[PDB]
Scaffold this motif. Sequence first.
Motif, PDB file in Angstrom:
ATOM      1  N   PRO A   1       2.409   1.236  -5.542  1.00 28.79           N
ATOM      2  CA  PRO A   1       2.010  -0.028  -4.809  1.00 28.79           C
ATOM      3  C   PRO A   1       2.772  -0.375  -3.747  1.00 28.79           C
ATOM      4  CG  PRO A   1       2.386  -0.279  -7.294  1.00 28.79           C
ATOM      5  CD  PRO A   1       2.854   1.276  -6.643  1.00 28.79           C
ATOM      6  N   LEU A   2       4.149   0.092  -3.455  1.00 31.63           N
ATOM      7  CA  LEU A   2       4.690  -0.111  -2.229  1.00 31.63           C
ATOM      8  C   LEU A   2       4.112   0.321  -0.914  1.00 31.63           C
ATOM      9  CD1 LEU A   2       8.359   0.328  -4.056  1.00 31.63           C
ATOM     10  CD2 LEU A   2       6.956  -1.791  -3.450  1.00 31.63           C
ATOM     11  N   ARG A   3       3.305   1.401  -1.160  1.00 30.46           N
ATOM     12  CA  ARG A   3       2.443   1.963   0.035  1.00 30.46           C
ATOM     13  C   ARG A   3       1.897   1.051   0.828  1.00 30.46           C
ATOM     14  NH1 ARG A   3       2.237   7.502  -1.456  1.00 30.46           N
ATOM     15  NH2 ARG A   3       3.556   7.798   0.605  1.00 30.46           N
ATOM     16  N   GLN A   4       1.343  -0.185   0.149  1.00 32.36           N
ATOM     17  CA  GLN A   4       0.453  -1.013   0.920  1.00 32.36           C
ATOM     18  C   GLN A   4       1.395  -1.617   2.123  1.00 32.36           C
ATOM     19  OE1 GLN A   4      -1.385  -4.132  -1.671  1.00 32.36           O
ATOM     20  NE2 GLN A   4       0.111  -3.736  -3.049  1.00 32.36           N
ATOM     21  N   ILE A   5       2.758  -1.846   1.935  1.00 30.78           N
ATOM     22  CA  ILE A   5       3.893  -2.375   2.645  1.00 30.78           C
ATOM     23  C   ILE A   5       3.855  -1.682   3.998  1.00 30.78           C
ATOM     24  CG2 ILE A   5       6.131  -3.112   2.998  1.00 30.78           C
ATOM     25  CD1 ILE A   5       6.528  -3.396   0.155  1.00 30.78           C
ATOM     26  N   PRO A   6       3.399  -2.510   5.131  1.00 26.72           N
ATOM     27  CA  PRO A   6       3.498  -1.677   6.512  1.00 26.72           C
ATOM     28  C   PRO A   6       4.882  -0.852   6.674  1.00 26.72           C
ATOM     29  CG  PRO A   6       3.496  -3.867   6.662  1.00 26.72           C
ATOM     30  CD  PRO A   6       3.123  -3.833   5.235  1.00 26.72           C
ATOM     31  N   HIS A   7       4.441   0.303   7.166  1.00 24.55           N
ATOM     32  CA  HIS A   7       5.529   1.300   7.630  1.00 24.55           C
ATOM     33  C   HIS A   7       6.485   1.765   6.578  1.00 24.55           C
ATOM     34  CE1 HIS A   7       4.477  -0.316  11.471  1.00 24.55           C
ATOM     35  NE2 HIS A   7       4.912  -1.520  11.228  1.00 24.55           N
ATOM     36  N   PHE A   8       5.758   1.674   5.304  1.00 23.96           N
ATOM     37  CA  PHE A   8       6.669   2.261   4.110  1.00 23.96           C
ATOM     38  C   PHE A   8       6.258   3.762   3.948  1.00 23.96           C
ATOM     39  CE2 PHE A   8       9.202  -0.405   1.181  1.00 23.96           C
ATOM     40  CZ  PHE A   8       9.476  -1.613   2.072  1.00 23.96           C
ATOM     41  N   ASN A   9       6.886   4.456   4.758  1.00 28.18           N
ATOM     42  CA  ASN A   9       6.672   6.050   4.849  1.00 28.18           C
ATOM     43  C   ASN A   9       7.324   6.615   3.459  1.00 28.18           C
ATOM     44  OD1 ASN A   9       9.656   6.703   5.443  1.00 28.18           O
ATOM     45  ND2 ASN A   9       9.350   5.486   7.128  1.00 28.18           N
ATOM     46  N   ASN A  10       7.058   7.626   3.187  1.00 30.25           N
ATOM     47  CA  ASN A  10       7.684   8.602   2.102  1.00 30.25           C
ATOM     48  C   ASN A  10       9.162   8.537   1.855  1.00 30.25           C
ATOM     49  OD1 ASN A  10       5.002   9.051   1.838  1.00 30.25           O
ATOM     50  ND2 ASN A  10       5.497  11.192   1.269  1.00 30.25           N
ATOM     51  N   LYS A  11       9.962   8.514   2.973  1.00 35.15           N
ATOM     52  CA  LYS A  11      11.428   8.302   2.731  1.00 35.15           C
ATOM     53  C   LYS A  11      11.745   7.156   2.137  1.00 35.15           C
ATOM     54  CE  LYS A  11      12.515  11.381   6.913  1.00 35.15           C
ATOM     55  NZ  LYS A  11      12.922  11.365   7.859  1.00 35.15           N
ATOM     56  N   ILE A  12      11.422   6.081   2.842  1.00 30.76           N
ATOM     57  CA  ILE A  12      11.478   4.581   2.250  1.00 30.76           C
ATOM     58  C   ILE A  12      10.937   4.775   0.905  1.00 30.76           C
ATOM     59  CG2 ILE A  12      10.722   2.418   2.099  1.00 30.76           C
ATOM     60  CD1 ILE A  12      10.824   2.377   5.468  1.00 30.76           C
TER      61      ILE A  12
END
Length: 309
Positions: A143-154
Amino acid sequence: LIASHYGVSFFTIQSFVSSLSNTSTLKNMLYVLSTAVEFESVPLRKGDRALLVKLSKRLPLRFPEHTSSGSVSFKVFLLLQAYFSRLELPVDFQNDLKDILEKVVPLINVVVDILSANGYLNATTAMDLAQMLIQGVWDVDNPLRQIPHFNNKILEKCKEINVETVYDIMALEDEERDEILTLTDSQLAQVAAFVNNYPNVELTYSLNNSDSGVKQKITIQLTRDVEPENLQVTSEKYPFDKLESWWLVLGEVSKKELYAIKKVTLNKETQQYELEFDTPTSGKHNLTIWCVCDSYLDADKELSFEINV
């Protein structure tokens, strides 16, 4: 941007009705959507099929085997999956995908309407697809993937600390937040825009308590922690302007029947609506109420209760 207006053609409504059923799956719906005559305005160039066949090897849902892949339907079905999976695309497909996305919202709502007008509960699966089309992710994605710029590292440094939802991020202290948010101020601006309007509502309801061939009216109310400044949707991947909307749904999971539905906008710190349904077959029924957003994932709410017939 502004999506060019249009009313789904009656011809497409006929096609959708003919193809959809109470058992249609997310995949079936994506395929059905891809068949809309409306998409024939999307370019199909020499060499595209060969590129799309390659692309299909990297995507989860298969195009109906014994169906010609020389149609624009093949392109729409696959690019939409490439969109959800966030795969890199050459510029011409990028241009085509944008043209495809400009037309999807009206079409997915027609799917939702057809399934719901028939009382089919898989209407909720069409809603999941509706959310996916707006945020450019799969229903099964983090679900956090929809947040802009939330790459795999974050995402990984959200996992260690056990941060799972947008709300968790905000429930965070401030340097646990900063450790998570290792981005430029410019990027943080777009993260901010997203979290600023990401909804968090509370769902409740009431009855009349006693019946039968006639209509019972339930009262559903939705509560927000603050009337949103506005309902303009933030989507990193959807290129057009979109206003936030919700579907209020009353159903019976065991029978997968959809009693009634209502499309509303939660523009206030508090709202109340009333849905009229028919009053079921005696004995008793285990009923649920869903409040589903059409523009974000993971913000939906539901509650079930028992009618004693």
